[PDB]
Amino acid sequence: NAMNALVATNRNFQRASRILGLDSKLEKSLLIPYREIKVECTIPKDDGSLVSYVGFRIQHDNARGPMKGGIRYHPEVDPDEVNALAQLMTWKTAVVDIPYGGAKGGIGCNPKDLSISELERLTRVFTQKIHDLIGIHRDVPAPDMGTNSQTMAWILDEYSKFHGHSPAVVTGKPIDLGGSLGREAATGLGVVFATEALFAEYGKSISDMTFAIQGFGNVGTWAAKAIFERGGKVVAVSDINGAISNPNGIDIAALLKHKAGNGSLKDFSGGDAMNPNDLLVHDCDVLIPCALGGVLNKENANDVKAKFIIEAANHPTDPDADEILSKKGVIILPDVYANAGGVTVSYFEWVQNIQGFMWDEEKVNQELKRYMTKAFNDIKANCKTHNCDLRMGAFTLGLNRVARATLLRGWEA
Amino acid sequence: VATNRNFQRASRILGLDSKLEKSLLIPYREIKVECTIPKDDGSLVSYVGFRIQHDNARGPMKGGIRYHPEVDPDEVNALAQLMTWKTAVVDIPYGGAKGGIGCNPKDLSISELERLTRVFTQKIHDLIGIHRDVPAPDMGTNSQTMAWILDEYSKFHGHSPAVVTGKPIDLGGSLGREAATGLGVVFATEALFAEYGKSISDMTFAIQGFGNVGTWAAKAIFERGGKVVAVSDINGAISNPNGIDIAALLKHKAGNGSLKDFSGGDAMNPNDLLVHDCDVLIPCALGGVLNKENANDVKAKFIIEAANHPTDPDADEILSKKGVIILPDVYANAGGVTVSYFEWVQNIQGFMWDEEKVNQELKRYMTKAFNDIKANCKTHNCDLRMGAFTLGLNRVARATLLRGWEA
Amino acid sequence: SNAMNALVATNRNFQRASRILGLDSKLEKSLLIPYREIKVECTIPKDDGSLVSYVGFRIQHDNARGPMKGGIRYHPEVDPDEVNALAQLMTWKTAVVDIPYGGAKGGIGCNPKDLSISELERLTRVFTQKIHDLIGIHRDVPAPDMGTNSQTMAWILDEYSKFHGHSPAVVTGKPIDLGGSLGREAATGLGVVFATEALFAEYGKSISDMTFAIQGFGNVGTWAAKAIFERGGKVVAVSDINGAISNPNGIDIAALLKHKAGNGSLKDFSGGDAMNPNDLLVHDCDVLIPCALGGVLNKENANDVKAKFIIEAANHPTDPDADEILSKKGVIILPDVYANAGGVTVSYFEWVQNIQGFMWDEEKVNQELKRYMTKAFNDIKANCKTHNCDLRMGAFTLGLNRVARATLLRGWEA
Ligand SMILES: NC(=O)c1ccc[n+]([C@@H]2O[C@H](COP(=O)([O-])OP(=O)(O)OC[C@H]3O[C@@H](n4cnc5c(N)ncnc54)[C@H](O)[C@@H]3O)[C@@H](O)[C@H]2O)c1
Ligand SMILES: NC(=O)c1ccc[n+]([C@@H]2O[C@H](COP(=O)([O-])OP(=O)(O)OC[C@H]3O[C@@H](n4cnc5c(N)ncnc54)[C@H](O)[C@@H]3O)[C@@H](O)[C@H]2O)c1
Ligand SMILES: [Ca+2]
Ligand SMILES: [Ca+2]
Ligand SMILES: [Ca+2]
Ligand code: NA
Ligand code: NA
């Protein structure tokens, strides 16, 4: 089904390089990651027996600043996937013009199969094995699929044994350990700010549309909530265990309460249970993938009903699907812009930490809006001077900014 | 003895479990180091310096350095633990510490005190730090002491202005530092009063003590229209039922005048201050002044504890029965430690604030802290003293639990 | 060896200010000795593979008030006494405007015009390798100077960061795309105007009240002239050392700016009258602003100056004989150590923005610049009253006393 994640991302990178006319030698430098790290992570389970994993940290580019990107605990984590995600962070940070490069990490494990004490030990061992490589001004992790603010607390705590109290070494922290107000909701809310900027160009409002949402974690819950509050009609939601639909709109606040009491989507009373395999091809105006990458591919792209796709997940649409969907008249707001709210507020968390003084939530949200608005305006102008679609307008915008910084730094030893 | 019972009560109010409680009572780290220097005449003297680092779950530790003899370890430990709670009460990102040198600084020359300070810094240079443990002045030490610690520490770790607070302005100290505690008392009083719908401008005040805290609090009250009807210090007292002209009074103190010889009031017995007719009583000078003998004769309906522990538990109950509200010391006099945080912030950001910004941030922190204390009081159905204690204790507990325990 | 304009001015001024303050002679001796002097071998392969060896250097004069600060000159004339004097002057200058730095000065004895861009980059990176442990965000923060520029700073940043991690604050003057500050090009000229505004307020006058003659039309002259023009000042004469134009109605500085943009020269400009650039300093005006050159006011022309105010934007336009004649004529001289400090003040702001991890917009940079410059004038004015002295000594006594106080508070025991 899914195209190789790194093959897909490199095809977009090649398409973007051609638009900019990049010299092949500069292009090759920008493609190769700065550093790839794979480390053994062996822990005792709660009964004392050993389990061994491999942890990864791919540091793709640091021309524009310390590297930035989250840590995924998921059974399909592998070098290709982490490499593709890391490269995308390099472009995304540059799209929103925050002073970071790109990185990504992960462990190939299933968190549902580990106890909370095992997850803590695994997280601390991973931190021990990379403590030299990450750092406030080197590489700053954060959550991603299968990790959360408690995971980041353990990274902070273990890292600080080696280098002293270092709040800014990781973002997505709990509020009570130096996290930023607004960070938990930031990706989902930024999706909404990105969607509003796009709909403004077409003269539409969120309240005009129906929505289908794949995935219901940190990104999908906050995105659905924010859409729901602004009058959007959310007609289907899936997660790994099932899905729920309602053509008149799901009461998202009620669905989230039901979820917080350990209810499953399929059992929610204000909707009809559905097969999650039918989510991406469900009738809707706007489709928002909020789970795995590569899920829109040559096999299902012709059956997409949506007129808009908002890429909240990282690389949910492969290049085969891009072209099919373009010919169906579908507009795709690309991941490196639409889901950048998270890393943007991560930047603000990091700033607050190094300034030793936290901001109020209204300032975090004012700055998020300003960053997301400016990035969209830059993409629009870039699509014009280069006469390209939104994915390429954002991709070339970030790639060109990375090239500039790379060229200023130079190459002598 | 009463301190351990009090911590247990606060712990049980919060529902902490015994294992967490035991951990919170054990200090993170205790250090003692030999400090030997040549005297001015070349002969040696040897002292022991120490630092009790109580807790660092919420950030770098913070606390004073005392140059004073007759060191009592139990009392040093108690004060380090108190700083852990106090920093959490006003929500500044520090834990608690206390240190010192067992010496009598009156017996040392200024060059001997400098050498002793530098040697002590040499002996603890890897255990203090901008993000590790940030000392401050205390009994027997001052901003000059801090300057020497900074200078010697920076030889080891590079220029590190935020390694200590209380610095001279000329070496990175903060504007507003001298007035911080007295002014913070007043911002705290304004927050308390607004909760009852009252304003400083409609209250009368009696103030015990006219030193660093009492002078600045009186000034700030006077400038907000408060009527200061009585003031005492160690040598005398002065009363005026229509309000003392505090600007005039501060001028008279500067010229080495006495409170009793001030013309803008009537001299009074300083032993009569706490029982003076007023709306608001502010003990600023001494602890242990309100006890079972005099608490029934207090006439104020609000007591603002600027001094540390002015009120014993007998008095607390007596005054509660009389419907008196007591703003507790741990919060009310926290403006000094709060501005010390701002000093550290300004240092780390490399860019100092003007005095207006320091004072606005101080008012902001003191106001939010009051509202957090009051909300906690509603949650646990307790008075302000216990509400403040449980707020601080719970914040430390929460950070500790989030950090976790696996190696 | 011991004789350039900046050496004589600084040690004359240091000595005079030290006596006004009554500084102890042992403290004075310590303040004159630099903290540390560094010379390092810098050998590189040229593009053709052959070696060349230069000597790089950094004089670190004083750090009582903070990390040291100062430029890196790539220039073949290296005069050790002049380098020391300039590092010392930065110590006083930073103190005058109350920025938390001491002074330094460094460079490489080379002619950068003989080197390719790749050679300059290797030379810069090797120099950085040789001094990486002696500079740093909280130790010593270089900046551009004669023969170096923002590209030079990018290379220092990049190489230094190999040894210590990303360290944007290790140098100022960076490209905007690598953490440089907005407002840098205008900073010195705009600061001159902020300083002039403060001075004139003391007389209850405004720039719109005055006529101006400006010597120099480079980075400082253009921006000062632009900012004066926009505030209603009448710029009646401008010289660029090669030509000069006079207009008693006021020159249209906007028109003159566009003309310089069209690669025209001052003598080419049609919106005024031909004048001899050597007559600029004695031109009729209320305010004279020497921007381009030093030593130009001397005992032979001081008495023909017509201005009531002299704003020393350039470094050291006024020699000792002229300074005396002009004071006796009643002329008020805003001294260079203060008046042109806008550049170093905004370099302080760049370091702050880097340390804070978040860049300011240009409006904020310029509000902060005006605040720093205004407060420094008021402090200088206070010191003039305390010591009954002219503005130049009010400034030097202010900066010297701030360094002395910080030194005495830090103390002397080991
Ligand atoms: N967390 C952030 O700040 C952030 C920022 C930008 C983008 N992203 C991206 O958003 C996506 C989701 O991240 P998250 O933080 O929400 O993760 P999460 O672990 O919080 O939740 C992931 C969600 O996806 C669901 N899911 C997993 N496999 C699925 C499948 N096969 N079908 C349907 N649903 C499935 C899970 O059940 C869960 O509801 C990822 O691509 C991530 O990289 C995350
Ligand atoms: N930042 C701070 O100064 C700070 C911080 C926390 C707590 N406190 C509390 O405030 C108290 C006062 O601190 P300070 O800096 O104002 O001290 P200070 O030495 O500057 O002034 C003390 C004042 O108390 C008076 N006094 C002493 N004994 C008295 C007595 N028996 N009756 C009446 N007046 C008497 C003195 O004459 C003087 O007026 C401390 O002892 C402590 O309890 C101070
Ligand atoms: Ca690369
Ligand atoms: Ca011994
Ligand atoms: Ca010296
Ligand atoms: Na001696
Ligand atoms: Na070559």
Short mmCIF file of C-alpha atoms in Angstrom, two decimals, chain B residues 67-378:
data_model
loop_
_atom_site.label_atom_id
_atom_site.label_comp_id
_atom_site.label_asym_id
_atom_site.label_seq_id
_atom_site.Cartn_x
_atom_site.Cartn_y
_atom_site.Cartn_z
CA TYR B 67 28.05 34.48 58.56
CA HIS B 68 27.22 33.84 62.20
CA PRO B 69 28.49 31.55 64.98
CA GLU B 70 26.51 29.00 67.04
CA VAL B 71 25.33 27.16 63.94
CA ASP B 72 22.43 24.80 64.65
CA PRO B 73 22.02 22.17 61.91
CA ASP B 74 18.35 21.55 62.72
CA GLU B 75 17.59 25.25 62.29
CA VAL B 76 19.59 25.53 59.04
CA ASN B 77 17.68 22.52 57.70
CA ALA B 78 14.34 24.02 58.78
CA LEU B 79 15.17 27.31 57.00
CA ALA B 80 16.24 25.58 53.79
CA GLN B 81 12.99 23.63 53.77
CA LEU B 82 11.02 26.83 54.40
CA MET B 83 12.63 28.40 51.34
CA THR B 84 11.48 25.44 49.27
CA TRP B 85 7.89 26.16 50.32
CA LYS B 86 8.22 29.95 50.01
CA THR B 87 9.55 29.92 46.46
CA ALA B 88 6.61 27.70 45.49
CA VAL B 89 4.06 29.95 47.22
CA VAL B 90 4.88 32.89 44.90
CA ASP B 91 5.46 30.53 41.93
CA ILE B 92 9.09 31.43 41.23
CA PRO B 93 11.09 28.61 39.53
CA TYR B 94 13.44 27.70 42.38
CA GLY B 95 13.86 25.26 45.23
CA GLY B 96 15.20 25.98 48.72
CA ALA B 97 18.69 26.11 50.24
CA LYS B 98 20.51 27.66 53.17
CA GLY B 99 24.21 28.04 53.86
CA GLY B 100 26.79 29.93 55.83
CA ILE B 101 30.09 29.97 57.64
CA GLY B 102 30.35 29.48 61.35
CA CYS B 103 32.21 32.65 62.22
CA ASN B 104 31.66 36.00 63.88
CA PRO B 105 32.23 38.56 61.11
CA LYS B 106 32.69 41.34 63.67
CA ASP B 107 36.02 39.67 64.56
CA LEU B 108 37.37 39.73 61.00
CA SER B 109 38.77 42.61 58.98
CA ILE B 110 37.29 43.46 55.61
CA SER B 111 40.27 41.86 53.88
CA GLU B 112 39.84 38.70 56.01
CA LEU B 113 36.13 38.59 55.20
CA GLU B 114 36.97 38.85 51.51
CA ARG B 115 39.52 36.06 51.64
CA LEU B 116 37.12 33.87 53.61
CA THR B 117 34.33 34.51 51.10
CA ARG B 118 36.60 33.68 48.16
CA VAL B 119 37.93 30.50 49.77
CA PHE B 120 34.39 29.37 50.55
CA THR B 121 33.47 30.02 46.94
CA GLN B 122 36.48 27.98 45.79
CA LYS B 123 35.30 25.13 48.00
CA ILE B 124 31.69 25.13 46.66
CA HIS B 125 32.19 26.40 43.11
CA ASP B 126 30.93 23.26 41.38
CA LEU B 127 27.93 22.94 43.70
CA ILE B 128 26.48 26.45 43.13
CA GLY B 129 25.62 27.79 39.69
CA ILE B 130 23.11 29.83 37.72
CA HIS B 131 20.97 26.73 37.09
CA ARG B 132 22.04 24.81 40.20
CA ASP B 133 21.99 26.93 43.39
CA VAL B 134 21.90 30.72 43.64
CA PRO B 135 23.03 32.25 46.96
CA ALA B 136 21.86 35.52 48.48
CA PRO B 137 22.77 37.71 51.46
CA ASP B 138 21.59 36.89 54.97
CA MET B 139 22.64 37.59 58.54
CA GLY B 140 26.28 38.67 58.53
CA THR B 141 26.54 39.05 54.73
CA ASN B 142 25.62 41.78 52.24
CA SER B 143 25.87 42.91 48.63
CA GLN B 144 29.66 43.24 48.93
CA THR B 145 29.82 39.59 50.02
CA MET B 146 27.84 38.65 46.91
CA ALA B 147 30.21 40.69 44.71
CA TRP B 148 33.14 38.66 45.98
CA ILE B 149 31.35 35.35 45.39
CA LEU B 150 30.53 36.44 41.84
CA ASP B 151 34.08 37.53 41.15
CA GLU B 152 35.66 34.33 42.47
CA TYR B 153 33.05 32.01 40.97
CA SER B 154 33.51 33.60 37.55
CA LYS B 155 37.16 32.59 37.54
CA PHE B 156 35.97 28.98 37.45
CA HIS B 157 32.95 29.24 35.14
CA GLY B 158 33.31 32.55 33.28
CA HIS B 159 31.39 35.74 33.94
CA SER B 160 28.22 34.53 35.68
CA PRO B 161 26.17 37.45 37.04
CA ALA B 162 23.14 35.27 37.81
CA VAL B 163 25.09 32.98 40.15
CA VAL B 164 24.12 35.17 43.13
CA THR B 165 21.42 37.70 43.85
CA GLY B 166 21.53 40.77 46.05
CA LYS B 167 24.42 42.16 44.02
CA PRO B 168 25.40 45.83 43.96
CA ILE B 169 23.62 47.72 41.20
CA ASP B 170 27.03 48.45 39.69
CA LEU B 171 27.61 44.65 39.23
CA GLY B 172 24.23 43.55 37.86
CA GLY B 173 21.94 43.97 40.84
CA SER B 174 18.30 44.90 40.28
CA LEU B 175 16.66 48.25 40.79
CA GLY B 176 13.92 48.05 43.42
CA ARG B 177 15.75 45.57 45.61
CA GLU B 178 15.94 47.63 48.79
CA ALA B 179 12.22 48.49 48.75
CA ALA B 180 11.10 45.06 47.49
CA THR B 181 9.95 43.46 50.70
CA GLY B 182 8.18 46.53 52.09
CA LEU B 183 6.52 47.33 48.78
CA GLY B 184 5.57 43.69 48.29
CA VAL B 185 3.86 43.73 51.69
CA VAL B 186 1.70 46.57 50.38
CA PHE B 187 0.88 44.90 47.05
CA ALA B 188 -0.10 41.81 49.06
CA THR B 189 -2.29 43.92 51.35
CA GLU B 190 -3.99 45.52 48.33
CA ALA B 191 -4.81 42.07 46.95
CA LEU B 192 -6.17 40.88 50.26
CA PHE B 193 -8.24 44.04 50.69
CA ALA B 194 -9.73 43.93 47.17
CA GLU B 195 -11.08 40.45 47.94
CA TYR B 196 -13.06 42.12 50.74
CA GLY B 197 -13.87 45.24 48.74
CA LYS B 198 -11.61 47.42 50.85
CA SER B 199 -8.96 49.95 49.83
CA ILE B 200 -5.80 51.15 51.61
CA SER B 201 -7.15 54.69 51.36
CA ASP B 202 -9.99 53.91 53.80
CA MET B 203 -7.86 52.05 56.39
CA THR B 204 -5.73 53.05 59.35
CA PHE B 205 -2.51 51.22 60.12
CA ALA B 206 -0.17 50.57 63.04
CA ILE B 207 3.36 49.44 62.22
CA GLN B 208 5.84 47.71 64.56
CA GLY B 209 9.36 48.36 63.32
CA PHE B 210 10.80 51.12 61.15
CA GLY B 211 13.80 49.52 59.43
CA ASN B 212 14.22 48.23 55.88
CA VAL B 213 10.74 46.71 55.81
CA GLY B 214 8.78 49.12 57.98
CA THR B 215 10.02 52.29 56.30
CA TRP B 216 9.23 51.16 52.75
CA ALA B 217 5.86 49.68 53.70
CA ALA B 218 4.87 52.85 55.56
CA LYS B 219 5.95 54.95 52.58
CA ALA B 220 4.02 52.83 50.12
CA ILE B 221 0.92 52.82 52.36
CA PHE B 222 1.13 56.58 52.86
CA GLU B 223 1.45 57.16 49.12
CA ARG B 224 -1.76 55.16 48.55
CA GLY B 225 -3.73 57.22 51.04
CA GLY B 226 -3.42 54.90 54.01
CA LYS B 227 -3.51 56.58 57.42
CA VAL B 228 -0.52 55.42 59.46
CA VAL B 229 -1.70 56.21 63.01
CA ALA B 230 1.14 54.54 64.97
CA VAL B 231 4.78 53.55 64.35
CA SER B 232 7.39 52.08 66.68
CA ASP B 233 10.98 50.94 66.58
CA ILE B 234 13.45 49.69 69.17
CA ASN B 235 13.84 53.05 70.95
CA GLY B 236 10.42 54.68 70.92
CA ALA B 237 7.09 55.21 69.22
CA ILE B 238 4.84 57.91 67.80
CA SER B 239 1.09 58.13 67.26
CA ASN B 240 -1.29 60.43 65.40
CA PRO B 241 -4.97 59.41 65.06
CA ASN B 242 -5.30 61.55 61.92
CA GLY B 243 -2.32 59.92 60.22
CA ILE B 244 1.42 60.50 60.51
CA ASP B 245 3.10 62.47 57.71
CA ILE B 246 5.40 59.57 56.69
CA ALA B 247 7.42 61.66 54.22
CA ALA B 248 8.13 64.13 57.03
CA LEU B 249 8.85 61.20 59.36
CA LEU B 250 11.31 59.59 56.93
CA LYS B 251 13.10 62.94 56.60
CA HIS B 252 13.45 63.14 60.39
CA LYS B 253 14.86 59.59 60.62
CA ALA B 254 17.44 60.40 57.95
CA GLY B 255 18.78 63.32 60.03
CA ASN B 256 19.32 60.88 62.93
CA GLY B 257 16.10 61.85 64.68
CA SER B 258 14.09 59.67 67.04
CA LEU B 259 10.49 58.57 66.62
CA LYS B 260 9.50 60.03 70.00
CA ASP B 261 11.05 63.45 69.24
CA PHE B 262 9.04 63.77 65.99
CA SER B 263 6.81 66.86 66.08
CA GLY B 264 4.05 65.52 63.83
CA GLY B 265 2.59 63.27 66.47
CA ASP B 266 2.42 62.32 70.13
CA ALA B 267 5.06 60.04 71.59
CA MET B 268 3.68 56.73 72.85
CA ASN B 269 4.81 53.68 74.78
CA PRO B 270 6.16 51.19 72.20
CA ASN B 271 4.81 48.38 74.37
CA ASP B 272 1.34 49.71 73.47
CA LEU B 273 1.72 49.39 69.70
CA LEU B 274 0.18 45.97 69.00
CA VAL B 275 -2.95 46.88 70.98
CA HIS B 276 -3.31 50.32 69.36
CA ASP B 277 -6.61 51.25 67.74
CA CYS B 278 -6.28 50.61 63.99
CA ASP B 279 -7.83 48.66 61.13
CA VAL B 280 -4.57 46.98 60.12
CA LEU B 281 -1.62 45.85 62.25
CA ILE B 282 1.72 45.19 60.53
CA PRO B 283 4.44 43.57 62.68
CA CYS B 284 7.64 44.32 60.77
CA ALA B 285 10.48 44.08 63.33
CA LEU B 286 10.31 41.06 65.61
CA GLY B 287 8.93 37.54 65.69
CA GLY B 288 6.95 36.11 68.58
CA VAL B 289 5.23 39.36 69.55
CA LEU B 290 1.62 38.08 69.47
CA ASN B 291 0.92 35.38 72.04
CA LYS B 292 -1.83 34.25 74.39
CA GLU B 293 -1.33 37.23 76.72
CA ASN B 294 -2.00 40.10 74.30
CA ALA B 295 -3.91 38.62 71.35
CA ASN B 296 -7.29 39.31 72.99
CA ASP B 297 -6.39 43.05 73.16
CA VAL B 298 -5.54 43.44 69.46
CA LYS B 299 -7.97 45.92 67.90
CA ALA B 300 -7.08 45.48 64.23
CA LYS B 301 -9.25 43.35 61.96
CA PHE B 302 -6.33 42.59 59.63
CA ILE B 303 -2.81 41.52 60.56
CA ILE B 304 -0.17 41.62 57.81
CA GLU B 305 2.83 39.53 58.86
CA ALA B 306 5.83 41.33 57.44
CA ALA B 307 8.09 40.03 60.22
CA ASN B 308 8.73 36.30 60.27
CA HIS B 309 6.56 34.35 62.73
CA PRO B 310 5.15 37.32 64.69
CA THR B 311 2.10 35.26 65.74
CA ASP B 312 2.18 32.02 67.74
CA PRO B 313 -0.53 29.34 67.41
CA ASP B 314 -2.34 30.43 70.59
CA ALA B 315 -2.70 33.91 69.15
CA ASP B 316 -3.83 32.52 65.76
CA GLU B 317 -6.82 30.81 67.39
CA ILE B 318 -7.66 33.76 69.64
CA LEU B 319 -7.56 36.15 66.69
CA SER B 320 -9.62 33.85 64.46
CA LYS B 321 -12.35 33.75 67.12
CA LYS B 322 -12.30 37.57 67.00
CA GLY B 323 -12.71 37.46 63.22
CA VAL B 324 -9.24 38.84 62.49
CA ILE B 325 -7.69 37.92 59.15
CA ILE B 326 -3.94 37.17 59.20
CA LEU B 327 -1.95 37.37 55.95
CA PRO B 328 0.85 34.89 56.63
CA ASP B 329 4.55 35.71 56.67
CA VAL B 330 5.54 33.08 54.13
CA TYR B 331 3.58 35.01 51.48
CA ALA B 332 3.35 38.57 52.77
CA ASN B 333 7.09 39.27 53.03
CA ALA B 334 8.02 37.38 49.84
CA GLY B 335 8.64 40.50 47.73
CA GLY B 336 12.36 40.32 48.48
CA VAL B 337 12.72 36.76 47.18
CA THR B 338 10.49 37.59 44.21
CA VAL B 339 12.66 40.54 43.15
CA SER B 340 15.73 38.30 43.63
CA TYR B 341 14.17 36.10 40.93
CA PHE B 342 13.77 39.16 38.72
CA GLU B 343 17.46 39.97 39.28
CA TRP B 344 18.39 36.48 38.06
CA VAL B 345 16.06 36.87 35.06
CA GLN B 346 17.55 40.22 34.10
CA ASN B 347 21.04 38.75 34.43
CA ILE B 348 20.25 35.68 32.28
CA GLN B 349 18.59 37.84 29.65
CA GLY B 350 21.62 40.16 29.67
CA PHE B 351 19.40 43.25 29.84
CA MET B 352 18.27 45.07 32.99
CA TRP B 353 14.75 46.39 33.64
CA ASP B 354 13.85 49.88 34.75
CA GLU B 355 12.45 50.20 38.28
CA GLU B 356 8.87 50.63 37.03
CA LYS B 357 9.04 47.25 35.27
CA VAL B 358 10.52 45.56 38.37
CA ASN B 359 7.66 46.90 40.49
CA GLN B 360 4.95 46.01 37.99
CA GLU B 361 6.29 42.48 37.76
CA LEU B 362 6.41 42.40 41.56
CA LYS B 363 2.79 43.54 41.86
CA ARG B 364 1.83 40.96 39.22
CA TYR B 365 3.54 38.10 41.05
CA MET B 366 2.22 39.10 44.50
CA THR B 367 -1.35 39.52 43.20
CA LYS B 368 -1.41 36.19 41.39
CA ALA B 369 0.07 34.47 44.44
CA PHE B 370 -2.68 35.87 46.66
CA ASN B 371 -5.35 34.66 44.26
CA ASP B 372 -3.76 31.21 44.12
CA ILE B 373 -3.58 31.05 47.92
CA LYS B 374 -7.22 32.09 48.25
CA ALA B 375 -8.34 29.53 45.67
CA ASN B 376 -6.43 26.83 47.52
CA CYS B 377 -8.09 27.97 50.76
CA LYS B 378 -11.48 27.39 49.15
#
